[model samples]
Target: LDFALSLLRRNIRQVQTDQGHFTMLGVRDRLAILPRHSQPGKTIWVEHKLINVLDAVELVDEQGVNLELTLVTLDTNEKFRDVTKFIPETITGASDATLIINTEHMPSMFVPVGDVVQYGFLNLSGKPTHRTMMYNFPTKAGQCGGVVTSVGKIIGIHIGGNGRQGFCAGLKRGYFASE
Candidate 1:
């Protein structure tokens, strides 16, 4: 367990914000962070849809320096850019294997991809918007963190949750590598 924790920790970074506790996926120079569904001073949307929106997130480092991050929507995925380029890594794909998430204020968890009972586009009200993967797991707000594989490879970004289930953007590696 200790060895596994160490391996997981290597790819995880704690992202502290005044709004909530968060996490990013990456190792060394390449890091991938996603936009939260709920942003301060904004109304929560009833459905999931792709929008080219720009927002700022304030991040504090161990040295107490404020790192401002700008989240930009490229195509259908969101990417974070820092002024100092601390997080240079982009997104990637994940295999249809066992998955894990380093949740906030809780121990790392195993969420089996094979256990996903539902796979479809997110349609909160009427029409479907984005692709999503659902699993029966106890997840909370601000706990999306990062979803990774046993080998520490990032697969997807946790977007939101409903009751006993959670959803993540089903992103492909080709999308991240393009442009």
Candidate 2:
């Protein structure tokens, strides 16, 4: 997929210090595809990874002052299985979901749990789709058990898929990487 290939072209420095790393998190799992969408009876199982934010961030300007910038990645490489095929096609695109970092914690501010974080996808042109799509509707709080968070601002983008349902594993909250 073009989206996956483009990831290789992305620079490490650009991602680490992009100023968009504050809220990004990673999850891994052996994702499973159930009988849904166009491909039924055929499950598309693969290793998954994501680089998303807990809140969205926007570049701002202060009184002749440029703030310090640091970027990080969201790790994903676990085994996940699901069978909730409620997603629609109109929301389909290069990436299955987009993360909405809780920008409320910006410029040195902190964010608490239960904050309305975002997850979904953007259009091919790199614009927020605003569609609920296949993102974790309500992100679980706390660390993902023992799973390690990947490094980079925008880790791996979901390009195309066999279109299966979504589900979670691991602890009671926060998706974790599959073993």
Candidate 3:
């Protein structure tokens, strides 16, 4: 938990809409949250735009189950947004690294990954369609917090997970807007 706390300047209040509740992270003047956490029809404020899932990548598990990774666009709004003093820089090489994740109940949790751990794919669901880089981090509902590296790099964002383990939406290029 200590490692995760180091990255979080302040905790932002949970974002609630007609659909469901979502966890938000304050980064400088901006806020970040998972688009999948909100209901499909719900409207999220991103500056002047009522934002939702702009794009997504769908995956099918070995059991023929379907999963999705949604890309959400966010803009700063002082009225509805909370700003943190710290803004995490996105970096690569998170695989097999000891990381930290924040949840609703748990402010921080230690996540140790193996060399096999990778992002962008789910292992518990079935065989990964792409290269195996998924980590088996335990999570619960409304615990879709952000994952940060030990050095305070924003690595991933928690989306959903079964009781056994959860998955995070890995950070990639063009995921966020420039300040």
Candidate 4:
């Protein structure tokens, strides 16, 4: 557990706002920090579990098969970016612009290139927000922090919430940034 937490802290940076909110993003060119045990198949599925249902998750395996649901964590407010420039190409057979979403608690299904995901409400008694991404591994373990440039604008550091999921507060740098 210590090694796991250390690896996570070493890979991802957490940024906090002045008001104490936060989010976490991927590290720049630091894919080595990510956890790897074996070679996964070409495809995967995914999903997210908010704090309300932190004990249950559903996802498929690397062989595109379903697995018994388990517990996983995905803080929606905490947005993560992939710092690996070649990941999309090497993993998904795409040269650019690869997007991944979690349909369950595992990175079960890797979306085909140029596909969009449709989300819906799961629990009727809780908030009506969409589900979080279910990464193949725990993203909190390895992430890169950098400036996000979008629509000719520079978006600063990503924030991560220490107390809850999907309620992150933005900071100047994410957890994986150089302090």
Which candidate has the highest lDDT of all? Answer: 3
Q: Sort the predicted structures by TM-score, highest score first.
A: 3, 1, 4, 2
lDDT per residue, candidate 1, 26-119, as tens digits? 4222334443432422211111222333333433234543222223222233233221222114323334434455545544655564443335
Q: What is the Å distance of residue 58 in model 3 from its true position?
A: 12
Worst lDDT window (10 residues) for model 2? 143-152
* lDDT at 80, model 1: 34
Candidate 3 residue-wise lDDT, 90-155, digit = tens: 324454544344434444455564322355445534534322234565556665544534344455
**Compared to the true structure, candidate 1 yields what TM-score?**
0.51
TM-score of each model, in listed order: 0.51, 0.18, 0.52, 0.21
How many residue pairs clash per model? Answer: 2, 29, 3, 34
- RMSD of candidate 2 to the truth, in angstroms, is 18.9
The Cα RMSD in angstroms, rounded to one decimal, for candidate 4 relative to the true structure is 17.7
lDDT of 4 by residue, 130-179 (tens): 22112122223112222122221212221111222211111112223332
Q: Rate the local accuracy (lDDT) of all candidates.
A: 0.43, 0.21, 0.45, 0.23
Q: Model 4 — which ten-residue stretch has the worst lDDT?
A: 31-40
Q: How well does candidate 2 score on lDDT at residue 66?
A: 16
